Amino acid sequence: MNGFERELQNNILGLMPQAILSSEHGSLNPQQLPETAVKLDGVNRVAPITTGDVVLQSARSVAVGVMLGIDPAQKDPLTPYLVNVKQTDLEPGKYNVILGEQLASQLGVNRGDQIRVMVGASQRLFNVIGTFAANSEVDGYEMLVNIEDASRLMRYPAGNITGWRLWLDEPLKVDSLSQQKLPEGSKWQDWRDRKGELFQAVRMEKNM
């Protein structure tokens, strides 16, 4: 089923980081490995990101999220799905957050509320300013924050980021693409880290 493949690509992989070029050791310093030095095969776009799993606590519930720390001035695949909120309200040092609609619902929060956002011992209160609604599973776990705020929560050195998010011409070929020559001291990680079972299903449907 190219049906299965098309759906996987458009409805899930289109709305999450397909791959990230990060540092071998710690966070990435974009002055040491700048965006212009990211020249990879099969990659059609590069953007900065700070990201990781976060534990979330509202007044009513708890959840695991995927924090997407973004430059609010760049269009994200989720930007067209924002509900009545401007991405540019994610100003650095405001600690605002835009939650997936379903994540927000499960936490029982509305805009104007705060939520506690935790990465191990590092914790910060973020201010819910809105939601996105893509009618995708990402609605249940992704959240958008300002990249600098996310880097602070992650305890990165000032100006550092997780790495360079990549968009791929053919995201189903991440196994081959991950073997290519990378900048020194960098490494490749991709969407298989989170959706491994769907990757295995793609392989299963092919071989039949």
Side-chain angles (χ1 to χ4, degrees), residues 14-73:
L15 303 177
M16 61 178 283
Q18 291 174 3
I20 302 174
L21 186 76
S22 68
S23 187
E24 278 282 41
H25 147 101
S27 50
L28 183 141
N29 176 350
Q31 286 168 346
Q32 185 62 13
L33 177 49
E35 187 163 14
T36 55
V38 180
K39 295 149 143 156
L40 300 172
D41 305 330
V43 171
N44 63 54
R45 183 184 164 197
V46 182
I49 195 169
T50 290
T51 184
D53 279 13
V54 292
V55 176
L56 305 178
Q57 182 182 11
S58 60
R60 292 175 182 82
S61 207
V62 301
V64 182
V66 179
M67 176 176 67
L68 307 175
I70 60 160
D71 178 348

Side-chain angles (χ1 to χ4, degrees), residues 5 21-22 93 110 119 124 128 139 159 165 168 170 184 205:
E5 289 169 336
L21 186 76
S22 68
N110 291 277
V119 179
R124 283 168 181 292
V128 181
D139 293 352
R165 179 172 175 180
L168 309 175
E170 300 175 280
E184 258 147 20
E205 293 211 351

Side-chain angles (χ1 to χ4, degrees), residues 65-83:
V66 179
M67 176 176 67
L68 307 175
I70 60 160
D71 178 348
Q74 300 202 218
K75 188 222 156 83
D76 187 84
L78 291 167
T79 304
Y81 301 102
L82 296 176
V83 176

Side-chain angles (χ1 to χ4, degrees), residues 147-159:
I147 188 171
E148 298 175 45
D149 296 355
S151 293
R152 268 307 290 124
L153 186 61
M154 298 291 284
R155 303 211 84 98
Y156 291 166

